[PDB]
Design a protein around this ligand. Structure first.
Ligand SMILES: O=c1c2sccc2n(C[C@@H]2COc3ccccc3O2)c(=O)n1O
Ligand SMILES: O=c1c2sccc2n(C[C@H]2COc3ccccc3O2)c(=O)n1O
Ligand code: NI
Ligand SMILES: [Zn+2]
Length: 331
């Protein structure tokens, strides 16, 4: 059955609820972003209205083959009405097309659903700053104080320097970036840019990137694997066995592979010869401190976690931090 934290009280709206069949009473199915854990169950056979960002709409149409008639894209930072309810979509600082949703209920209740997000101080200078938020449906992925990771700017700097130094030393080295979900494009795009290269990838991945409305995307990506010094591979192929196999397929060129595995929370590489694999802490979710700062700024009356809610221990642990944040901030 559809869980309580995927339903919007006082409306017939659900959020990221496509793996429970037809949810009783639901008139509009919202999709925060095009990540599999969240669109799970959506297919070409889905027959109900889906509300989402323009970018997510492109991906629904072109990758999932959802009929255009059920896809209702909405602009960002724009007040819109859906089934009689005022809503606003805000950038979630997650992956391309990912949004947070502000629901303005008729009774004056304001609900913010963060989808997946990486909290940032720029959100404290947005449409959120105006009205009060009574319920917060919160991406609690890393709601534990051990979850610290650097800024995205810091991780990109390490990746760029690592890649530039390795290829300037060895002009015949190959850089590979593991990708699965959309998101974290800055990793391979920044590496390619500093190497004066395009990023080669499979046709299915090129098609995915073409849906993302990235400025000047045809100037940085290509399907011609041979021509590029940066290759995208499925993340499950980012291993010594796969990188050796991929090493041979490049017409015997490239005598070295430098690979990046962009993992959120776990730097030296695992090296088996001419192959090195860097796990880099590029996250598109809030760290604990970023999450805590956002919530203490927003001062919501009620928090509904949407992540790690499946065990009583995790729910109890998150409620403790919520109380600590509320006591410390005085709301
Ligand atoms: O919906 C998901 C799902 S479903 C299964 C995995 C995920 N992840 C990746 C997880 C997030 O939490 C993590 C904590 C520690 C290490 C890796 C992690 O990776 C996610 O980041 N999101 O958003
Ligand atoms: O934000 C994310 C991220 S970040 C990295 C992966 C994801 N996923 C995909 C899910 C399902 O597939 C996965 C496979 C491997 C690791 C995590 C996964 O999580 C997601 O569904 N969301 O929403
Ligand atoms: Ni996600
Ligand atoms: Zn997720």
């Amino acid at each position: 059955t559809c869980p309580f934290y995927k339903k919007i009280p006082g409306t017939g709206f659900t959020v990221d609820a496509f793996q429970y069949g037809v949810v009783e009473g639901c008139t509009a199915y919202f999709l925060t972003h095009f990540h599999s854990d969240h669109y799970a169950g959506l297919s070409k056979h889905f027959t109900f209205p889906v509300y989402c960002s323009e970018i997510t709409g492109n991906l629904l149409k072109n990758k999932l083959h959802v009929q255009e008639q059920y896809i209702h894209p909405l602009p960002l930072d724009t007040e819109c009405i859906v089934n009689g309810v005022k809503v606003v979509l805000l950038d979630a600082n997650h992956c391309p097309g990912a949004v947070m949703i502000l629901f303005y209920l008729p009774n004056g209740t304001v609900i913010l659903h963060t989808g997946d997000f990486r909290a940032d101080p720029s959100m404290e200078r947005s449409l959120l700053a105006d009205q009060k938020v009574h319920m917060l449906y919160l991406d609690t992925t890393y709601c534990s104080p051990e979850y610290t990771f650097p800024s995205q700017q810091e991780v990109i700097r390490f990746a760029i320097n690592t890649a530039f130094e390795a290829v300037t030393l060895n002009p015949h080295a190959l850089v590979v970036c593991g990708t699965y979900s959309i998101g974290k494009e800055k990793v391979f795009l920044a590496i390619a840019d500093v190497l004066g290269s395009k990023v080669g990838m499979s046709q299915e991945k090129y098609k995915t990137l073409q849906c993302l409305n990235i400025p000047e995307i045809n100037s940085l990506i290509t399907t011609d694997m041979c021509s590029s010094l940066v290759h995208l591979l499925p993340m499950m192929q980012i291993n010594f066995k796969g990188l050796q196999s991929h090493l041979k397929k490049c017409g015997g060129k490239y005598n070295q592979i430098l690979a990046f595995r962009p993992t959120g929370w776990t730097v030296i590489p695992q090296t088996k010869g001419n192959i090195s694999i860097y796990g880099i802490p590029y996250s598109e979710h809030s760290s604990y401190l970023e999450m805590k700062r956002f919530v203490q700024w927003l001062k919501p009356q009620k928090i509904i976690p949407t992540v790690n809610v499946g065990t009583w221990k995790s729910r109890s642990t998150m409620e403790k931090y919520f109380r600590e944040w509320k006591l410390e901030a005085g709301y």
